[PDB]
Design an enzyme around this catalytic site. Structure first.
Site, short mmCIF file in Angstrom:
data_model
loop_
_atom_site.label_atom_id
_atom_site.label_comp_id
_atom_site.label_asym_id
_atom_site.label_seq_id
_atom_site.Cartn_x
_atom_site.Cartn_y
_atom_site.Cartn_z
CB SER A 54 -0.83 -0.04 1.19
OG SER A 54 -1.42 1.36 1.44
CE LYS A 105 -3.48 1.73 4.82
NZ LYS A 105 -3.80 0.94 3.59
#
Ligand SMILES: Nc1ncnc2c1ncn2[C@@H]1O[C@H](COP(=O)(O)OP(=O)(O)O)[C@@H](O)[C@H]1O
Ligand SMILES: Nc1ncnc2c1ncn2[C@@H]1O[C@H](COP(=O)(O)OP(=O)(O)O)[C@@H](O)[C@H]1O
Lengths: 177, 177, 516
Positions: free
Chosen positions: C424, C467
């Site tokens: 990611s 996140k």
């Protein structure tokens, strides 16, 4: 008590070797001391022996029209599986006895393999047991343990026989790959 | 108590003894009168979090007892270990003395484990090595110094760190935990 | 007789009555006070204990169900909506026995308390028994009467305790479990006819409501999975952890410790200090442990003679819980060239990471990139792909800039993210390399995440909630995401994404434009 075991066989067709084993175990149970270890062993053994459907078969639907309707009713498509089941029924009708096969459905997940298996069981009027070989890694889960060991349970085909109470059970083995 | 087989003692027989609601009627086979163990403080010890069956592992409250730092070990050795080892080996304080300096050195270079058992072993070893001299007549008294300690406990198990009174261009001092 | 009036009060089935009077006459051949007497005594006691026809009236009312669910728990709006959907469907169908509900999620989120709340809402009787590696059937079905260890089992004990034929049985930790017994327990073909070993007579478990809980579904056997309806219970943000601790955790623990409000206090500020410092989970389990610790030490204080009434303000908190852990904070308030702020979705939850690059040899032959951080094979592949895309992007954008294709770089991605979503950080790696090659530092308060392909397409990632939570907590004003995560970012909340300028992208070129 010996009575229950003697009676559970009155509705079966028990082969001679199974009857020999049952008789010697019943004499052993008669001669043993109650609520002892060997008594529990022999009791579990006679229980599993007399809870096997020894000569019982379920009566199958052999009408092609009704079977085809029951198949077309539960699932769309799947012409290979449906043609195979119809040929199975035609061959079982051309004879009198019951037939046994081993088939394998492979394909992506979620396309109806297990569901069409259950529908086939419905159409044939057989029973239906399923166990998974998904990640199993001990041969005892299929073959069974001795009677000597403490756990000592018989396999999984013996358990499906004891459950379905018949000899035409349509076993389904998922995840053989 | 690893596994439970033929009437397993490990968990089934003990949970009803450590369960708060069950034990208030504790059924013992002999003396068949369910007794209450309500006002009873249960303290269990272990050296691994696991290898306790979960039905108990969730019934208790794990309290961790970690090892000792060097100064903790020195305080333990001076409060308990050296006096008790003297009381056993029958040596008085004057016939052989263990200064805090030599005890600190022993801990720093010989006993770097978590418990006090190895430290007690080393203290007993020093005291009996000196007792042997007292008895064999040589050295009617004994004094243990950080120089002749290798004569009592052998060569150190760990390696000594270097020491720099003036650091060369290559080395730097640093603090470790 | 006692047993006679026992069975006289409740509606006994005929076969049961026959068997109990049979065994009562068998005791009639008195064998006073022996093994074969106390066996019969215990048998008849269990028999007259089991309720036979008597049940508890239910309440499928949506209004009262909703009131109970909102009272017993805070938050969990989506789980409550799923429960109400189950209740409405079960009122329509009328059976309320079709498919088994199973809540799963991180530990400490209170999926075991939803069962008690559901029992209250349905006016049933609650009962719980856990299955952690039981490996036996004697817990469910029991033992025979011949053994000196003769116990009916969990189900019969539940029935005797609830005195009700249709109770609620929670099954805890299915994913930690022996399973065929659960199949026979849950299948409506044989629930109506359940055979205890200590009770040769059968029982009817058809009107019994079973619930399940687990920590993860992958390890639950697929036989059970085909028979359970999975409900996902997510963790709580800090703002709602505070509410849970104020309304439930602290009162419950103060009751546990025998205190009351007039003697031990916990302010909102010290509670949120606990939440943010001494706990970094998604549940409330560690927070509950810390609150219990505080209250136990306060009880000791008020007993020891001193401090008749104790107060825990954020200044004397280290006397109770200890020194602050998880204090480490943002590593760079103004990032130099070659450092970029990426977002990571770790095990414990979100985090912010500083991907760093540095030249390592003074500046034909090709340059080289060595990568540190405990990286796996997939993550090394991702680093190589990002490296090559950054090389090509520079050789297309600034064809005279020679930095990437000749210099020797050192890349460090911090070791926080799970083995999955490790790739990611691709856009973060590409931006770090570009920021090092050019002389420009990245935009001031800018955090990013998303996968990058060999040709620069920005591919989606997971854990957008964690996140963005970590990104806001780290004081970030501008966040960048892939374009296929618009749903994930917009469907989480409104009090989490308010002052957060978000940019959704599909190719890397526009990331470059909005980062320089
Ligand atoms: N051709 C089809 N017609 C009707 N239903 C289907 C069909 N294919 C799949 N399904 C449905 O999909 C569901 C899940 O399929 P499943 O049997 O679990 O797939 P798998 O082959 O992985 O076992 C089934 O409940 C079935 O009703
Ligand atoms: N939303 C909530 N409202 C009230 N209490 C909660 C909430 N979430 C968790 N809890 C508390 O968490 C505890 C149960 O944790 P739980 O989720 O059951 O852990 P596990 O899922 O591992 O069994 C209970 O004491 C309960 O009060």
């Amino acid at each position: 008590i010996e009575e229950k075991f003697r009676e559970r066989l009155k509705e079966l067709v028990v082969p001679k070797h199974v009857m020999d084993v049952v008789d010697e175990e019943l004499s052993k149970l008669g001669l043993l001391d109650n609520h002892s270890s060997e008594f529990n062993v022999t009791r579990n053994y006679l229980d599993w022996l007399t809870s096997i459907p020894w000569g019982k078969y379920s009566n199958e639907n052999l009408d092609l029209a009704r079977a085809q309707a029951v198949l077309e009713e539960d699932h769309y498509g799947m012409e290979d599986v449906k043609k195979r089941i119809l040929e199975f029924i035609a061959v079982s009708q051309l004879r009198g006895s019951t037939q046994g096969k081993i088939l394998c459905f492979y394909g992506p997940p979620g396309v109806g393999k297990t569901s069409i298996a259950r529908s086939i069981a419905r159409a044939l009027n057989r029973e239906y047991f399923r166990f998974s070989v998904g990640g199993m890694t001990d041969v005892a889960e299929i073959k069974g343990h001795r009677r000597t060991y403490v756990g000592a349970m018989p396999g999984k085909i013996i358990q499906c026989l004891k459950k379905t109470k018949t000899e035409n059970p349509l076993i389904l083995i998922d995840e053989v790959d | 108590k690893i596994g439970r087989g033929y009437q397993g003692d490990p968990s089934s027989a003990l949970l009803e003894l450590l369960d708060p609601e069950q034990n208030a009627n504790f059924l013992d086979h002999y003396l068949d009168v369910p007794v209450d163990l309500s006002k009873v403080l249960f303290i269990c010890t272990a050296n691994v979090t696991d290898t306790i069956p979960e039905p108990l592992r969730d019934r208790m409250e794990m309290i961790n007892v970690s090892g000792y730092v060097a100064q903790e070990k020195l305080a333990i050795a001076e409060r308990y270990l050296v006096p008790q080892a003297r009381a056993l080996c029958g040596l008085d304080e004057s016939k052989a003395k263990l200064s805090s300096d030599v005890l600190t050195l022993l801990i720093k270079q010989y006993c770097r484990e978590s418990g006090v058992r190895n430290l007690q072993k080393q203290v007993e070893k020093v005291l009996r090595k000196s007792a042997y001299k007292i008895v064999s007549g040589e050295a009617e008294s004994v004094e243990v110094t950080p120089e002749n300690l290798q004569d009592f406990v052998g060569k150190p198990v760990f390696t000594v760190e270097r020491m720099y009174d003036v650091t060369p261009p290559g080395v730097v001092m640093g603090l470790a935990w | 007789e006692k047993f006679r009036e026992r069975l006289k009060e409740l509606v006994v089935p005929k076969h049961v009555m026959d068997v109990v009077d049979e065994e009562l006459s068998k005791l009639g051949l008195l064998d006073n006070h022996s093994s074969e007497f106390n066996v019969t005594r215990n048998y008849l006691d269990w028999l007259t204990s089991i309720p036979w026809g008597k049940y508890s009236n239910e309440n499928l009312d949506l209004a009262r169900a909703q009131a109970v669910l909102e009272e017993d728990h805070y938050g969990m709006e989506d789980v409550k909506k799923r429960i109400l959907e189950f209740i409405a469907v079960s009122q329509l169908r009328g059976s309320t026995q079709g498919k088994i509900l199973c809540f799963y999620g991180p530990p400490g989120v209170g999926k075991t308390s939803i069962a008690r709340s559901i029992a209250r809402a349905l006016n049933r009787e609650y009962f719980r028994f856990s299955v952690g590696g039981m490996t036996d059937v004697a817990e469910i079905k029991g033992h025979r009467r011949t053994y000196v260890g003769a116990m009916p089992g969990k189900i019969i004990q539940c029935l005797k305790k609830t005195k009700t034929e249709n109770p609620l049985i929670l099954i805890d930790e299915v994913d930690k479990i022996p399973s065929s017994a659960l199949l026979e327990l849950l299948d409506p073909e044989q629930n109506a006819n359940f055979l205890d070993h200590y009770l040769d007579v059968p029982v009817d478990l058809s009107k019994v409501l079973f619930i399940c809980t687990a920590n993860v579904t992958d390890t639950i056997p697929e036989p059970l999975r085909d028979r359970m309806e999975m409900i996902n219970v997510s963790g709580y943000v800090a703002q709602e952890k505070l509410a849970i601790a104020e309304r439930y955790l602290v009162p419950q623990a103060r009751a546990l410790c025998g205190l009351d409000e007039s003697k031990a206090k916990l302010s909102s500020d010290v509670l949120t200090l606990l939440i943010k410092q001494y706990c970094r989970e998604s549940g409330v389990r560690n927070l509950q442990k810390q609150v219990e610790k505080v209250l136990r030490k306060s009880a000791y204080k008020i007993v020891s003679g001193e401090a008749e009434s104790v107060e825990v303000t954020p200044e004397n908190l280290q006397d109770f819980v200890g020194k602050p852990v998880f204090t480490v904070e943002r590593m760079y308030d103004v990032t130099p060239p070659g450092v970029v702020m990426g977002l990571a979705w770790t095990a414990m939850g979100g985090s912010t990471l500083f991907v760093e690059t540095s030249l390592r040899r003074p500046q034909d032959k090709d340059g080289s990139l060595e990568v540190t951080g405990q990286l796996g094979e997939v993550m090394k592949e991702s680093a190589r792909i990002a490296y090559t895309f950054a090389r090509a992007f520079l050789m297309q954008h600034a064809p005279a800039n020679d930095y990437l294709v000749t210099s020797h770089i050192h890349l460090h991605v911090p070791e926080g993210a799970t083995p999955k979503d490790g790739p990611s950080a691709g856009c973060t790696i590409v931006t770090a390399l570009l920021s090092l090659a050019m002389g420009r530092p990245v935009r001031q308060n800018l955090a990013m995440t998303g996968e990058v392909s060999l040709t620069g397409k920005i591919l989606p990632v997971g854990g957008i909630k964690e996140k963005t939570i970590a990104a806001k907590r780290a004081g970030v004003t501008c966040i960048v995401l892939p374009a296929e995560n618009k749903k994930d970012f917009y469907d989480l909340a409104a009090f989490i994404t308010e002052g957060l300028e978000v940019h959704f992208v599909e190719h890397y070129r526009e990331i470059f434009d909005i980062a320089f």
